[PDB]
Amino acid sequence: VNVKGNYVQVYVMLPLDAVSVNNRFEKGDELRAQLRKLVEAGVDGVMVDVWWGLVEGKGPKAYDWSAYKQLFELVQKAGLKLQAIMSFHQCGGNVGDAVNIPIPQWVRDVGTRDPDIFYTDGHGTRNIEYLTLGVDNQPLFHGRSAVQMYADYMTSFRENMKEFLDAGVIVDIEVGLGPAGEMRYPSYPQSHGWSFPGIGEFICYDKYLQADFKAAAAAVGHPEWEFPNDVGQYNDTPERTQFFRDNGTYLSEKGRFFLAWYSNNLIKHGDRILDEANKVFLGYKVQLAIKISGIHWWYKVPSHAAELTAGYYNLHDRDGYRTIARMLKRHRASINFTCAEMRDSEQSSQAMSAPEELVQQVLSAGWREGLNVACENALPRYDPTAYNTILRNARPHGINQSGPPEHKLFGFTYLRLSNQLVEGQNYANFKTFVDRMHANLPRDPYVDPMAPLPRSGPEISIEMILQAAQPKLQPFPFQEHTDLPVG
Ligand SMILES: OC[C@H]1NC[C@H](O)[C@@H](O)[C@@H]1O[C@H]1O[C@H](CO)[C@@H](O)[C@H](O)[C@H]1O
């Protein structure tokens, strides 16, 4: 009997403005006090947004790392590990978001003469939270492309934070690839005309993506093809549209081409930025991760409409997450997925929502491609049931008494630290959750050591990535309930 191989690391997300909207570290005493409560609970580490808009706010290459170094020093002195998100996106900007941190003003200024640097919907609405993947390789930003700006930021981060890396404080680099840091399109703009559980919209109308589609359509002998026009609008349901309805045009040749194109572009966006990240962090003992958004609504209907509009080309017979996983493989990148706290019975009937099955599909895809998989909770939860659902997903086959289980999450990150979390009943529930994730063992500061990051393997074509889509395989079997609940 040795249950050590069952331990799952638990990280906690810091507050969104751990660093102030003015790029100052102003909450040091309050955070130290909260971190003491996390250390008392046995937490392995914390996660924090490293906001592009704060650090490179002045101008190109004018990186101001002062506040972040203060924060990282505080985390180190607390004996906690650190997952750093390269947050190339806007924080907040919805009603009524308390914390609002845009991308750098000088980047946005380029959009005054070139508004097509932003993902754009079919109404022409520009989303200012992130730069279109369409401009990844366009030298529009005082001579740099978007990918070059991302690479340069990560390089400056590595150089400035080298002591924290070498000391084993920073153990994970999560590469932001879209809105909210997630590798997706902004298909569900909650403050600009989407409400849950709308199907969302395709956000591929920027002129760069239009030109790319035109070139792609021409290469297969269909210069006449255009984006689907029978797709309805953000707050529709699938049967409101000819495209997404059961037996709809999403199944057609044109529909398939478009959906492959839209989803492949996200895959290529991830691959090219991860290649850069891998070069930056080469030889450091860190995990590189991407975040996949949890689009659980409409998972139960044939079109998987909300997944499709977010950029996940996922159907009953097409595994739209295992393609992503296959692209990650060469980089030795991990999947960070959400919804690990949700039960299907917690969702409204009308949303046709299947978070449990979606989690199961994404985890199984990752594991079949040999990846490390970690999770977050999607929504704030403080109750034993939410923790017991996380536990189930953390060890789907339960505990192995003599050695490592067959499948397990590499890590779990809790959203998010606040004063509410670390007091009263919420805290008692959380501490017990951490014990159970650790298989009732104490915190192991040596757990899950990372080898020096090797260089990405050979680039593989999109055709090679897409061999992972079919045949769609059944997920690995998950226990209905955890064998090590909180109580
Ligand atoms: O962690 C990414 C996102 N996961 C799904 C949740 O429902 C989102 O709230 C979450 O995004 C939020 O937190 C991250 C991490 O701090 C931040 O980068 C996003 O901007 C924020 O919206």
Coordinates of all heavy atoms in Angstrom, one line a residue, residues 231-268:
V231 N -27.2 31.1 -40.6 CA -26.6 30.7 -39.3 C -27.3 31.5 -38.2 O -26.9 31.3 -37.0 CB -25.1 31.0 -39.3 CG1 -24.3 30.0 -40.2 CG2 -24.8 32.5 -39.6
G232 N -28.3 32.3 -38.5 CA -29.0 33.0 -37.5 C -28.1 34.0 -36.7 O -27.2 34.6 -37.3
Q233 N -28.4 34.2 -35.4 CA -27.7 35.1 -34.6 C -27.4 34.7 -33.2 O -27.9 33.6 -32.8 CB -28.5 36.4 -34.6 CG -28.7 37.1 -35.9 CD -29.5 38.4 -35.7 OE1 -29.0 39.5 -35.7 NE2 -30.8 38.3 -35.4
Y234 N -26.7 35.5 -32.4 CA -26.2 35.1 -31.1 C -27.2 34.3 -30.3 O -26.8 33.3 -29.7 CB -25.7 36.3 -30.3 CG -24.4 36.9 -30.9 CD1 -24.5 38.2 -31.5 CD2 -23.2 36.3 -30.7 CE1 -23.3 38.7 -32.1 CE2 -22.0 36.9 -31.2 CZ -22.1 38.1 -31.9 OH -20.9 38.6 -32.4
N235 N -28.4 34.8 -30.1 CA -29.3 34.3 -29.1 C -30.3 33.3 -29.7 O -31.3 32.9 -29.0 CB -30.0 35.4 -28.3 CG -29.0 36.1 -27.5 OD1 -28.0 35.6 -27.0 ND2 -29.2 37.4 -27.3
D236 N -30.1 32.9 -30.9 CA -30.9 31.8 -31.5 C -30.6 30.5 -30.8 O -29.7 30.4 -30.1 CB -30.7 31.7 -33.0 CG -31.5 32.7 -33.8 OD1 -32.5 33.2 -33.3 OD2 -31.0 33.1 -34.9
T237 N -31.5 29.5 -31.0 CA -31.3 28.1 -30.8 C -31.1 27.4 -32.1 O -31.4 28.0 -33.2 CB -32.5 27.5 -30.0 OG1 -33.6 27.4 -30.9 CG2 -32.8 28.4 -28.7
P238 N -30.6 26.2 -32.1 CA -30.2 25.6 -33.4 C -31.4 25.5 -34.4 O -31.2 25.7 -35.6 CB -29.7 24.2 -33.0 CG -29.0 24.5 -31.7 CD -30.1 25.4 -31.0
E239 N -32.6 25.1 -33.9 CA -33.7 24.9 -34.8 C -34.2 26.2 -35.5 O -35.0 26.1 -36.4 CB -34.8 24.0 -34.2 CG -34.3 22.7 -33.8 CD -34.0 21.8 -35.0 OE1 -34.8 21.7 -35.9 OE2 -32.9 21.1 -34.9
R240 N -33.8 27.3 -34.9 CA -34.1 28.6 -35.6 C -33.3 28.9 -36.9 O -33.6 29.9 -37.5 CB -33.8 29.8 -34.5 CG -34.7 29.8 -33.2 CD -36.1 30.2 -33.5 NE -36.2 31.4 -34.4 CZ -36.5 31.4 -35.7 NH1 -37.0 30.3 -36.3 NH2 -36.3 32.5 -36.3
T241 N -32.4 28.0 -37.2 CA -31.5 28.3 -38.4 C -31.4 27.1 -39.3 O -31.6 25.9 -38.8 CB -30.0 28.5 -37.8 OG1 -29.5 27.3 -37.4 CG2 -30.0 29.5 -36.7
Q242 N -31.2 27.3 -40.6 CA -31.1 26.2 -41.5 C -29.7 25.6 -41.3 O -29.6 24.4 -41.7 CB -31.3 26.7 -43.0 CG -32.7 27.1 -43.3 CD -33.7 25.9 -43.2 OE1 -33.3 24.7 -43.5 NE2 -34.9 26.2 -42.9
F243 N -28.7 26.3 -40.8 CA -27.3 25.8 -40.7 C -27.2 24.7 -39.6 O -26.7 23.7 -39.8 CB -26.3 26.9 -40.5 CG -24.9 26.4 -40.6 CD1 -24.2 26.2 -41.8 CD2 -24.2 26.1 -39.4 CE1 -22.9 25.8 -41.8 CE2 -22.9 25.7 -39.4 CZ -22.2 25.5 -40.6
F244 N -27.7 25.1 -38.4 CA -27.5 24.3 -37.2 C -28.6 23.3 -36.9 O -28.5 22.5 -35.9 CB -27.3 25.2 -36.0 CG -26.1 26.1 -36.1 CD1 -26.3 27.5 -36.3 CD2 -24.8 25.6 -35.8 CE1 -25.2 28.3 -36.4 CE2 -23.7 26.5 -35.9 CZ -23.9 27.8 -36.1
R245 N -29.8 23.4 -37.6 CA -30.9 22.5 -37.2 C -30.5 21.1 -37.5 O -29.5 20.8 -38.3 CB -32.1 22.9 -38.0 CG -32.1 22.7 -39.5 CD -33.4 22.9 -40.1 NE -33.4 22.5 -41.5 CZ -33.6 21.3 -42.0 NH1 -33.9 20.3 -41.1 NH2 -33.6 21.0 -43.3
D246 N -31.2 20.2 -36.9 CA -31.0 18.7 -37.1 C -31.2 18.5 -38.6 O -32.2 19.1 -39.2 CB -32.0 17.9 -36.3 CG -31.6 16.5 -36.2 OD1 -30.6 16.1 -36.8 OD2 -32.3 15.8 -35.4
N247 N -30.3 17.9 -39.3 CA -30.3 17.7 -40.8 C -30.1 18.9 -41.5 O -30.4 19.0 -42.7 CB -31.6 17.0 -41.3 CG -31.7 15.6 -40.7 OD1 -30.8 14.8 -40.8 ND2 -32.9 15.3 -40.1
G248 N -29.4 19.9 -40.9 CA -29.2 21.2 -41.5 C -28.0 21.3 -42.4 O -27.3 20.3 -42.7
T249 N -27.7 22.5 -42.9 CA -26.6 22.7 -43.9 C -25.2 22.5 -43.3 O -24.2 22.5 -44.0 CB -26.8 24.0 -44.6 OG1 -26.7 25.1 -43.7 CG2 -28.2 24.0 -45.3
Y250 N -25.1 22.4 -42.0 CA -23.8 22.2 -41.4 C -23.2 20.9 -41.9 O -22.0 20.7 -41.9 CB -23.8 22.3 -39.8 CG -24.3 21.0 -39.2 CD1 -23.4 20.0 -38.8 CD2 -25.7 20.9 -38.9 CE1 -23.9 18.8 -38.1 CE2 -26.1 19.7 -38.3 CZ -25.2 18.7 -37.8 OH -25.8 17.6 -37.2
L251 N -24.1 20.0 -42.3 CA -23.7 18.7 -42.8 C -23.2 18.6 -44.3 O -22.6 17.7 -44.7 CB -24.8 17.7 -42.7 CG -25.4 17.4 -41.3 CD1 -26.8 16.8 -41.5 CD2 -24.4 16.4 -40.5
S252 N -23.5 19.7 -45.0 CA -23.2 19.8 -46.4 C -21.8 19.9 -46.7 O -20.9 20.1 -45.8 CB -23.9 21.0 -47.0 OG -23.4 22.3 -46.6
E253 N -21.4 19.7 -48.0 CA -20.0 19.9 -48.4 C -19.5 21.3 -48.0 O -18.3 21.4 -47.5 CB -19.8 19.7 -49.9 CG -18.3 19.6 -50.4 CD -18.1 19.5 -51.9 OE1 -19.1 19.8 -52.7 OE2 -17.0 19.2 -52.3
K254 N -20.2 22.3 -48.4 CA -19.8 23.7 -48.1 C -19.7 23.9 -46.6 O -18.7 24.6 -46.2 CB -20.8 24.7 -48.6 CG -20.7 24.9 -50.1 CD -21.9 25.6 -50.7 CE -22.2 27.0 -50.1 NZ -20.9 27.8 -50.0
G255 N -20.6 23.4 -45.9 CA -20.7 23.5 -44.4 C -19.5 22.9 -43.7 O -18.9 23.5 -42.9
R256 N -19.2 21.6 -44.2 CA -18.0 20.9 -43.7 C -16.7 21.7 -44.0 O -15.8 21.7 -43.2 CB -17.9 19.5 -44.3 CG -19.1 18.6 -43.9 CD -18.8 17.1 -44.2 NE -18.3 16.8 -45.6 CZ -19.2 16.6 -46.6 NH1 -20.5 16.7 -46.5 NH2 -18.7 16.4 -47.8
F257 N -16.6 22.2 -45.2 CA -15.4 22.9 -45.6 C -15.2 24.1 -44.7 O -14.1 24.4 -44.1 CB -15.5 23.4 -47.0 CG -14.2 24.2 -47.5 CD1 -13.1 23.6 -47.8 CD2 -14.3 25.6 -47.4 CE1 -12.0 24.3 -48.2 CE2 -13.1 26.3 -47.8 CZ -12.0 25.7 -48.2
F258 N -16.3 24.9 -44.5 CA -16.3 26.1 -43.6 C -15.9 25.8 -42.2 O -15.0 26.4 -41.6 CB -17.6 26.9 -43.7 CG -17.6 28.0 -42.6 CD1 -16.9 29.1 -42.8 CD2 -18.4 27.8 -41.5 CE1 -16.9 30.1 -41.8 CE2 -18.4 28.8 -40.5 CZ -17.7 30.0 -40.7
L259 N -16.6 24.8 -41.6 CA -16.3 24.4 -40.2 C -14.9 23.9 -40.0 O -14.3 24.2 -39.0 CB -17.3 23.4 -39.8 CG -18.7 23.9 -39.7 CD1 -19.7 22.7 -39.5 CD2 -18.9 25.0 -38.5
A260 N -14.3 23.1 -41.0 CA -12.9 22.7 -40.9 C -12.0 23.9 -41.0 O -11.1 24.0 -40.2 CB -12.6 21.6 -42.1
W261 N -12.4 24.8 -41.9 CA -11.5 26.0 -42.1 C -11.4 26.8 -40.8 O -10.3 27.3 -40.4 CB -12.0 26.9 -43.3 CG -11.3 28.2 -43.3 CD1 -10.1 28.5 -43.9 CD2 -11.8 29.4 -42.8 NE1 -9.8 29.8 -43.8 CE2 -10.9 30.4 -43.1 CE3 -13.0 29.8 -42.1 CZ2 -11.0 31.8 -42.7 CZ3 -13.2 31.1 -41.8 CH2 -12.2 32.1 -42.1
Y262 N -12.6 27.0 -40.2 CA -12.7 27.9 -39.0 C -12.0 27.3 -37.8 O -11.3 28.0 -37.1 CB -14.2 28.0 -38.7 CG -14.7 29.0 -37.7 CD1 -14.6 30.4 -37.8 CD2 -15.2 28.6 -36.5 CE1 -15.0 31.3 -36.8 CE2 -15.6 29.4 -35.5 CZ -15.6 30.8 -35.7 OH -16.1 31.6 -34.7
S263 N -12.2 26.0 -37.6 CA -11.6 25.3 -36.5 C -10.1 25.0 -36.8 O -9.3 25.1 -35.8 CB -12.3 24.0 -36.3 OG -12.4 23.1 -37.4
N264 N -9.7 24.8 -38.0 CA -8.3 24.6 -38.3 C -7.5 25.8 -38.1 O -6.3 25.8 -37.6 CB -8.1 24.2 -39.8 CG -8.5 22.8 -40.2 OD1 -8.8 21.9 -39.3 ND2 -8.7 22.5 -41.5
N265 N -8.1 27.0 -38.3 CA -7.4 28.2 -38.1 C -7.0 28.4 -36.6 O -5.9 28.9 -36.3 CB -8.2 29.4 -38.7 CG -7.6 29.9 -40.1 OD1 -6.4 29.7 -40.4 ND2 -8.4 30.6 -40.8
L266 N -7.9 28.0 -35.7 CA -7.6 28.1 -34.3 C -6.4 27.1 -33.9 O -5.5 27.5 -33.2 CB -8.9 27.8 -33.6 CG -8.9 28.0 -32.1 CD1 -8.8 29.5 -31.8 CD2 -10.1 27.4 -31.5
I267 N -6.5 25.9 -34.4 CA -5.4 24.9 -34.3 C -4.1 25.5 -34.8 O -3.1 25.3 -34.1 CB -5.8 23.6 -35.0 CG1 -7.0 22.9 -34.3 CG2 -4.6 22.7 -35.1 CD1 -7.5 21.7 -35.0
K268 N -4.1 26.1 -36.0 CA -2.8 26.6 -36.5 C -2.3 27.8 -35.7 O -1.1 27.9 -35.5 CB -3.0 27.1 -38.0 CG -3.4 25.9 -38.9 CD -3.3 26.3 -40.4 CE -4.4 27.2 -40.8 NZ -4.3 27.7 -42.3

